[PDB]
Every structure is written in C-alpha cells, then in structure tokens.
Design a protein around this ligand. Structure first.
Ligand SMILES: *[C@@H]1O[C@H](CO)[C@@H](O)[C@H](O)[C@H]1NC(C)=O
Ligand SMILES: *[C@@H]1O[C@H](CO)[C@@H](O)[C@H](O)[C@H]1NC(C)=O
Ligand SMILES: *[C@@H]1O[C@H](CO)[C@@H](O)[C@H](O)[C@H]1NC(C)=O
Lengths: 275, 9, 281, 99
C-alpha cells in the first residue's frame, strides 16, 4: 500500500484518413500491464508486463470479448457526440476515459474513479460517492440523464468495490517483486556555466520506481520553489523513471545550495551538493 | 480486469 | 498504402454524388484509380487525379470496386501500394423489394430480430443497409421460392449501434454493383435498459363517443420525449416531456385499444426505455 | 484546444561511448494524438524504432515513448524528429548528454 489500478481508453475518429480506432491500456501504479488496439488485424487484449503473462486463457478470452464490445460502444459514442454538439462528419474527434480504483496497504478500497473527456476537455465524471455524476456541459447532461435512467452508477460502483479491488490485489501479488519493491533513485549534481557570473546546478534522479518523487532546491534551508526549473518526470523504458531539477546560481555561491530528494525507495531523504 | 459496464453516451 | 474512402456514402442513388478520396503521405492529391478486375491497369486511361474524384451526377458506370495508388516520386517505383478497396453501389436500377421485421421492429436490448427482404423479381443478391452508416451493407444470396426471391438477415444481439432506419436492395446476376430502388424503410428501435414509464388515462380508460380522453406517460426519469404506441400497427405518436411540480416528467396525448408508452432522449431517436405496462382504453 | 508536444531526448542509462544503451525520445502534453516521431543518426532516420502504447495524463494530454537500441560515440550525432499538427515543420531535438 498504497496502490492503484487504472484503465485508459482512447477512441478516435479520423474521417478520410482511416477507420475509427479504439486503444485501451491498463496500469497497476506506474506499470502498464495490458493493451488492446482495434487497429490490429485480429485485436486481442494482450500482456504488456511479464507478471500477467501466465494468466490463463479464460482471462485473455474474456478480456478480449469485453474490449471488442467497448470498442463498438465508443465508436457509436463518437457518432452520438457528433449529434450532441452539432458537429460535421468531416472532422476528427476523440473520446477519452480513465477509470479504476485506489487501495490502501491492507488492500481495501480507498477511492473509485470514472472520468470521461471529449476532444481533450472534461465531459462527465463519477463523483466520489460512486452514485452520482458531474456533467461538464449540456451535451454531457444528456448522457447523465441516460445513465441515471439506466442505473449505470450502481453497476460501476459494484465493479469498483468488487472486481477492481480483488483483481488489483491479485496483480500486486503476481508482480510482488517488481510492483511492491520501490527502486530508489541514483542521484548526482552537475554544474553548467552560463557566463563567468552565473551557473546552472542540476540535480539528477535516475532509475527510480514508482514515478512519484520530490526534488527540491534550498538555499541555506529555504525552498527555492519560485526559482526552480523542474523537468517533467520521464520514463527510462525499463519501467523506471528519471527527473531533474535545476537552479541558476551566482558564481561562488554554489555551496549554499542543497538538493533534497524524497522517494519511497530511499531509507532517509537525501541531501546533495555540488562539488 | 477491465470494467464490464457499458457506457453508451 | 493509401486510405481510400467514399463521401458522403459508398451506397449512392443514380443521379446523386459521391467523391472518392485517396489519403497518402498526409495529402489528398496526385493519385490513380483501379477497379477490381484490372488490378495494375489504371482507369480513365491512367488519369492522374489532382484532387478527390467527384462523381456527379452518378451513373451506373460509376458502380464498382475501387482501389487507389498515390504518387511517390522518390521511391523505386513511381507509386504507392494499392489502397484498401471501396465498393461504390449505385441504387435505383430495379423495382424496389420489400423489407419486414420478425417478429417486429421494437427489439429488446440484447435480443435478436430477423429482417426479411423479398421480391417477385428474381434478385441474385440482397443488401441490407442502415441509413447513415459507413459499414458495408450486409449481403446475402437470394433464395427462390414460390415465385419470390428472399433473404433473412439476422440482427443482434441488439444494441444501439444496430438501431436505426434500414432499407434493403436487390441486385441481378450480371450487375452486382447495381442495386434496385430501396425498399420502404423500417425503423428498428432498441428498447431498454432505461426504466419503464407509467401510462394512465384521464378521466379513465372507459370512454364513449364522443367525449375526450387523454393518455399520460410519466416517469421520475428525465425523458425528453414520450412515444405512445397502440397495438395494431399505425406509427407511434410522439410528444415532448414536461417537468411537473412533483419532479416527474410527463406528456399528455389527447386521443379504443391497448396502449404502451416509451421514453427517449434528445438526439437519440432509436433507443427507447423499457415499455410501460399495457393500458386498455 | 490543440496542444503541441513537449520533447525530451535522453538515454536509458548514463551514456558511455562504445557501450550499448537505449536512445529515448519522450513526447508528451500533446493533443490530438496523431504524431510522427523518428530517431536520427546524423540526420538519417533509424529503422528499428519502437514506441509505447498510447496513453494520457490527468489533464488528458497524450504521451508516447520512442526508443531504439544504440551505442553512442563522439562523432555520431543522435536526435529526435517530431511532427504534429501544431508544427509547420518537424522539430528536431539533439540528444544532449547533459539534459
Ligand atoms: C473488391 O475487391 C477486393 C480486392 O481488391 C476483393 O478482395 C473484394 O472481395 C471485392 N469486394 C467485393 C464486394 O466484390
Ligand atoms: C426467415 O424468417 C422468417 C421469420 O422467422 C421465417 O418464418 C422463415 O422461415 C425464415 N427462413 C426462411 C428460409 O424463410
Ligand atoms: C405528479 O404530478 C402529476 C401531474 O399533476 C400527477 O399526475 C402525478 O400523479 C404525480 N406523480 C406522483 C408520483 O405524484
């Protein structure tokens, strides 16, 4: 604990460029473990992490049937959205969905999620109570009325309380030695001149998992939260991550600067300095 | 495991 | 390979219009067209289309099975691989067949329905096509029987993508891309899972000519429209739903027979709620 | 509501000339999803390039990782070439061992 499972769906139309496409990916924490892509010649849900590979054929068959149905549903949703927004059939549009569950150290549900977007903006989301919706506009309000009339939230709540949690627990066990063993960052500080009056100090963290991390620069103990360049955390490609934090310092003042690294894989927070 | 719940707009 | 598409529809009436577009290397220009039998022989004596090819007005000569190849100057051959195939089917060339649903046009979510096409013309093939779809019409070989040809299209398990207005067409043996006039259309509606509304009569279901009676469809669900259907087969009446002080949504149809009502929502005309309980007036 | 890609180019492991490694180009924060990414060795497209499955962040913008096995050298110059609807011409980002 604590852990999460999330599925991410992207359904896209592209009139005149290709057939509509539906891609789904599944994650446990920051680790992707399954994918389905409608563009494949013979689409199937497929393993994307070693610890799910030994799951039996009923798993793959069942998930494939479910994704095929979801793909059909979301292709139709693209058509419906055209009607809701009075848009032409010539344009390209995207529906995105993310859903799943968060659990605590004891494996019990902490929170459920189900959010959808149209063309990159919020469309409709399940509320924290898992029994009501927030619709972002009048179009989404139509969907909200349908879903209330069909009791969709009850079904989704049942999924989130039941299968979502039970399966996340199973995957966390299946993949225990990778999923439940944090990898601390390897860290170092580099120095890059700007002039002979200014310089950049760059604090590096490499090879860490999970992705969550905090890199801060302090100058005699005060956060430089206003003067820190922080690059987006990026994947190494081997299921670990990388990040750096930079600060521009006056020449000869390098020694009042300290980089502070916080990550679950570290026994104690690290305090680094350039030398 | 993915959600079996249909979400028709 | 290029992506070839027909706009607005590959199924098109004689006299109408259809444009073929060949998308390749992020452009729509400089391509050649080919038909299924001549696969390496470009039509119109190798015309190099400078932009999308608009056929208008459509003639039977436009019907066919097309692929395109796009220009690619800096490559071994001058050109791309063949695109996906697009079949232009031209309608309006024979007497229309007939289309009926078994057991009926209102289909419960998850269930199946048969759409039967038939004609006293001997059609070699039948085509079933949902209005507004890009999906290729479904094709079945015709079966001859007692002076008619016919085919049974199975539709389902029923879901929204399958609901809508359907027409069927015939083609004769030696002109398979030339379709008949369309059959009269049939609206196939999916019912459920939305909760059923309530039906009632005011003042009551007992009426004697000539005094007025209004039937009301009501629900706590926020239906935008109600449909009143009377057993016995004239098309449902529709009315907007109105919100009442007690928070119900209701429509009043002023009018014997056995009735049911269904709710539906804005922009969603082919999916209705579960049917109300029946009411005999 | 169109968002141009951010691009980072970097190796999986600390670079050391003559040692097999992985070259990465991470594109993120873009919308819509169509995008073209190539890894380059001296301006020329590397052939055996793979990419991750399309996904997106909490703000709905997409991200993808493109990667190829490679052995860095002093002279060979590697880069990432990215085109997206938001860009008039493809953007080219050099691999800088210090970024
Ligand atoms: C159209 O031609 C393709 C080959 O280009 C062929 O495979 C396909 O069966 C044809 N379709 C029809 C309906 O004849
Ligand atoms: C076609 O469907 C109808 C209705 O179910 C049925 O009566 C008929 O026998 C079916 N098959 C044939 C070959 O007519
Ligand atoms: C709500 O009000 C309507 C309209 O006056 C009335 O016909 C109906 O009986 C009421 N429904 C309920 C549940 O009270």
């Amino acid at each position: 604990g604590s852990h999460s499972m999330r599925y991410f769906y992207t359904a896209m139309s592209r009139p005149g460029r290709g057939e509509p496409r539906f891609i789904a990916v599944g994650y446990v924490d920051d680790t992707q473990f399954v994918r389905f892509d409608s563009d494949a010649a013979s689409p199937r849900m497929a393993p994307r992490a070693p610890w799910i590979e030994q799951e039996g054929p009923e798993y793959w068959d069942g998930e494939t049937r479910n994704m095929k149905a979801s793909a059909q549903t979301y292709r139709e949703n693209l058509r419906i959205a055209l009607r809701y927004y009075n848009q032409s059939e010539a344009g390209s549009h995207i529906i995105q969905v993310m859903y799943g569950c968060d659990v605590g150290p004891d494996g019990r549900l902490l929170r459920g999620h189900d959010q959808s977007a149209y063309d990159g903006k919020d469309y409709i989301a399940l509320n924290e109570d898992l029994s009501s919706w927030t619709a972002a506009d009048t179009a989404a309000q139509i969907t909200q009325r349908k879903w209330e009339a069909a009791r969709v939230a009850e079904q989704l709540r049942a999924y989130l309380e039941g299968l979502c949690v039970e399966w996340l627990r199973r995957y966390l066990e299946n993949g225990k030695e990778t999923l439940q063993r944090a990898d601390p960052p390897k860290t170092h500080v580099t120095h890059h001149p700007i002039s002979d009056h200014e310089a950049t100090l760059r604090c590096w963290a490499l090879g860490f998992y999970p992705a969550e991390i905090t890199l801060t620069w302090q100058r005699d103990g005060e956060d430089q939260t206003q003067d820190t360049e922080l690059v987006e955390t990026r994947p190494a490609g081997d299921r670990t991550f990388q990040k750096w934090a930079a600060v521009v310092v006056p020449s000869g003042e390098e020694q009042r600067y300290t980089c502070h690294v916080q990550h679950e894989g570290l026994p104690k927070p690290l305090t680094l300095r350039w030398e | 495991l993915s959600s079996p719940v249909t979400k028709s707009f | 390979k290029p992506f070839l598409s027909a706009w607005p529809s590959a199924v098109v009436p004689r006299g109408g219009h259809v444009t073929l577009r060949c998308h390749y290397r992020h452009r729509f220009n400089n391509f050649m067209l080919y038909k299924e039998d001549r696969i390496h022989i470009p039509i119109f004596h190798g015309r190099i289309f400078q932009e999308s090819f608009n056929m208008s007005p459509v003639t039977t000569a436009h019907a066919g099975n097309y692929t395109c190849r796009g220009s690619h100057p800096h490559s071994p051959t001058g050109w791309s691989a063949p695109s996906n195939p697009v079949v232009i089917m031209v309608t309006g060339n024979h007497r229309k067949p007939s289309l009926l649903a078994h057991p009926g046009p209102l289909v419960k979510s998850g269930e199946r329905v048969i759409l039967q096409c038939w004609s006293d013309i001997m059609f070699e093939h039948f085509f079933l096509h949902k209005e507004g779809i890009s999906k290729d019409p479904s094709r079945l070989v015709g079966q001859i029987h007692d002076g008619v040809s016919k085919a049974n299209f199975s539709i389902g398990p029923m879901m929204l993508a399958l609901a809508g207005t359907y027409r069927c067409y015939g083609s004769v043996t030696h002109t398979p891309y030339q379709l008949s006039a369309p059959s009269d259309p049939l609206d196939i509606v999916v019912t459920g899972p939305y909760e059923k509304p309530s039906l009632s009569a005011q003042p009551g279901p007992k009426v004697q000519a000539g005094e007025s009676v209004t039937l009301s469809c009501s629900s706590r669900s926020s239906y935008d429209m109600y449909h009143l259907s009377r057993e016995g087969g004239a098309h449902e009446r529709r009315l907007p739903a109105v919100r009442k002080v007690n928070r119900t949504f209701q429509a009043d149809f002023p009018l014997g027979g056995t009735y049911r009502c269904f709710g539906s929502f804005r922009h969603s005309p082919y999916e209705w709620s579960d049917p109300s309980d029946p009411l005999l007036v | 509501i169109q968002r141009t890609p951010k691009i980072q180019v970097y190796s999986r492991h600390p670079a050391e000339n003559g040692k097999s490694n992985f070259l990465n180009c991470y594109v993120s924060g873009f919308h819509p999803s169509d995008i073209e990414v190539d890894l380059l060795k001296n301006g020329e497209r590397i052939e055996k390039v793979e990419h991750s499955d399309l996904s997106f962040s909490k703000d709905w913008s997409f991200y993808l990782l493109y990667y190829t096995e490679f052995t860095p050298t002093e002279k060979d110059e590697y880069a990432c070439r990215v085109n997206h609807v938001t860009l008039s011409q493809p953007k080219i980002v050099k691999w800088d061992r210090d970024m």
